[PDB]
Amino acid sequence: RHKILHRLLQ
Amino acid sequence: DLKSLAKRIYEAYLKNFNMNKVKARVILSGNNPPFVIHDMETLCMAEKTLVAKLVANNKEAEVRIFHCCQCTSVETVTELTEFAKAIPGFANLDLNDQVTLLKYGVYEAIFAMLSSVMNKDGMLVAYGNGFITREFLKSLRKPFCDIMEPKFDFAMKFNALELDDSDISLFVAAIICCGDRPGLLNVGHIEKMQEGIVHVLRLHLQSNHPDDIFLFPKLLQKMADLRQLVTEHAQLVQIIKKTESDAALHPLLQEIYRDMY
Numbered sequence A: 001r002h003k004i005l006h007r008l009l010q
Numbered sequence B: 001d002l003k004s005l006a007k008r009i010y011e012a013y014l015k016n017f018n019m020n021k022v023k024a025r026v027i028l029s030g031n032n033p034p035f036v037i038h039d040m041e042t043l044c045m046a047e048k049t050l051v052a053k054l055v056a057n058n059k060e061a062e063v064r065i066f067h068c069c070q071c072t073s074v075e076t077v078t079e080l081t082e083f084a085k086a087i088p089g090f091a092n093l094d095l096n097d098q099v100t101l102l103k104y105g106v107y108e109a110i111f112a113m114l115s116s117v118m119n120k121d122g123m124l125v126a127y128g129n130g131f132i133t134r135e136f137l138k139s140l141r142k143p144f145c146d147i148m149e150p151k152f153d154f155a156m157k158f159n160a161l162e163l164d165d166s167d168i169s170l171f172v173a174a175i176i177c178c179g180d181r182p183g184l185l186n187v188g189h190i191e192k193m194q195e196g197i198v199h200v201l202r203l204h205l206q207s208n209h210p211d212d213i214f215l216f217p218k219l220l221q222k223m224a225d226l227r228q229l230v231t232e233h234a235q236l237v238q239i240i241k242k243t244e245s246d247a248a249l250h251p252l253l254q255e256i257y258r259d260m261y
């Protein structure tokens, strides 16, 4: 649901 | 031990945020002097010099300003994500919980740190190269004139606390590491991480501000004030989304606001 955040977190 | 945790968090803050309070104060005191935006003429001049691509073709001034607001927020969320990953303990968390903590914490942290580029007359923008006046923002048509004034009001009282970057970095870490966010999976572990950071903040304020014996509870209250400020801001952003077709919302910010409050 938060794909940009999840990407940023990696 | 805890002095070292405080220093690690301060170093992570200095590395990851493009603006800090020392940098801002050097600029606000008076190379690369800030261009003052106080009226429509100077807004359009500043746009041509500082965001040229945005005006090379145009939509109302208020919608262009709001686009620049969101671009700034997108950049600060990216900085906050890196800062968070450098917070001792954050990266051991479940990735789902990392997302949740950032989702609810970034705008509280944004408005806390915005105080560092604000004074009673205006605020620094565009990586320190513009200064937009508070009165000009008040002059915009509704609803856009209602975005920034509550943030200036928060900032004037926050800045009267006379925090420095070593305090603010711990305050921002405490904002992020908050165990009562909705939807957390491992509440107990997050509460223990929060207790650790808040303990470091408490000890740091005792050392760095021996003159203000209530500074730690003042800052706990500012955290609660920020949560309310963000709830209200999100409500305004929803009004803008629904009634202002030209004011598209950036996808990272849509993801953050969606199901937030």
Ligand SMILES: CCCCCCCCCCCCCCCC(=O)O
Residues within 6 Å of the ligand: B037, B043, B046, B047, B050, B051, B065, B068, B069, B070, B072, B073, B074, B125, B126, B130, B132, B147, B237, B253
């Ligand atoms: C010529 C550039 C003008 C830019 C003036 C506006 C920059 C303001 C930056 C702080 C914005 C804080 C409000 C955030 C809004 C949001 O993301 O929901």
